[PDB]
Amino acid sequence: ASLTEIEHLVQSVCKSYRETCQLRLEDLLRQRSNIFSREEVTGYQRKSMWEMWERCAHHLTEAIQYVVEFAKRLSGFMELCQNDQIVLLKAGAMEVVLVRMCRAYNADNRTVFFEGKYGGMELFRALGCSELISSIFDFSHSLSALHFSEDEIALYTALVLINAHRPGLQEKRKVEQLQYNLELAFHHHLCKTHRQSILAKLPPKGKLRSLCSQHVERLQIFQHLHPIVVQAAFPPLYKELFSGGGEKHKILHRLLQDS
Ligand SMILES: O=C(Nc1ccc2c(c1)N(S(=O)(=O)c1cccc(C(F)(F)F)c1)CC2)c1c(F)cccc1Cl
């Protein structure tokens, strides 16, 4: 691809990320002063474990839906075969959601934007997921040091999703060409912006994958112990991405058609 085609792809990715942002950046930076009271934190702490899980699962599902829209606008993604579109989203949607969260994370007090206000790790104590919640906060703490620009997050989360190493891809070769054109665009943008030192500081690819495994493997421990709660109160999209007996409901293969 030519240099201007590469510049074209940078702008098309950045505009695609602008249009499918769940939260606006200027709103997140003005809410940093809006912090949960200690009594509000205590409210979240005394809530029942299964109620706190459903609450967070729905908020996670809503964020993943904006990632599907992001994929749907990605250059080349909708040109892939559907089975590869599902494989890429089944694996990378939570990863994109975990990277996008670092915008809603305040490194200057180790708080995160949750339900309109910012709060620390102790907000989620009722989940009984101390280690998983810590890994998420530390992951966001690392990305916040990079001081990503919105354009840089656009190209980074694009590559997080368009990955040719994903198990199950039927047309692995076409995803390779997609991944190459995007990393060339990402690298070209970092070169024009004088932000190439970011690449050496980026987290190793495994930490994102290990975070997902940490996340998913913890869910079905909850789904095994509290199975009826998951089938009745957890949202469908969440069960298809993350549950064993939840792939019967077809949800992704309709978000990818209704355009
Ligand atoms: O909550 C979970 N994962 C998740 C991943 C990304 C996002 C959301 C949720 N939400 S959110 O507004 O609720 C929000 C906003 C800041 C921080 C957090 C938290 F990750 F600390 F919970 C959550 C949107 C972005 C979850 C779960 F469903 C089951 C077990 C353990 C966990 Cl962690």
Residue numbers in the entry: 265 to 523
Give me lines lifted from the publication on this model.
RAR-Related Orphan Receptor C (RORγ, gene name RORC) is an orphan nuclear receptor (NR) that is widely expressed and is involved in regulation of various metabolic processes. RORγ is also a key player in the immune system where the lymphocyte specific isoform RORγt is a so-called ‘master regulator’ of the IL-17 producing T helper (Th17) cell subset. Structural and functional analysis has revealed that the RORγ ligand binding domain (RORγLBD) is comprised of 12 α-helices (H1-H12) and a β-sheet region (BSR) that responds to cholesterol biosynthetic pathway intermediates, hydroxysterols and sterol sulfates. The results presented here indicate that the RORγLBD requires a ligand to stabilize the active conformer and that hyperactivating ligands enhance coactivator affinities by allosterically driving electrostatic intramolecular interactions between H12 and H4.
After obtaining co-crystal structures of partial agonist SR19265 and antagonist SR19355, we attempted and failed to solve co-crystal structures of full agonist SR19547 bound to the RORγLBD. While most compounds protected H12, SR19269 and SR19355 exhibited little protection to this region. However, SR19355 and SR19269 also exhibit commensurate H4 protection showing that the observed H4 stability depends on H12 stability. Importantly, SR19355 displayed much higher performance in this assay with no commensurate increase in protection at these regions. This highlights an important limitation to the approach where differences in binding mode (an additional hydrogen bond in this case) can identify compounds as outliers.
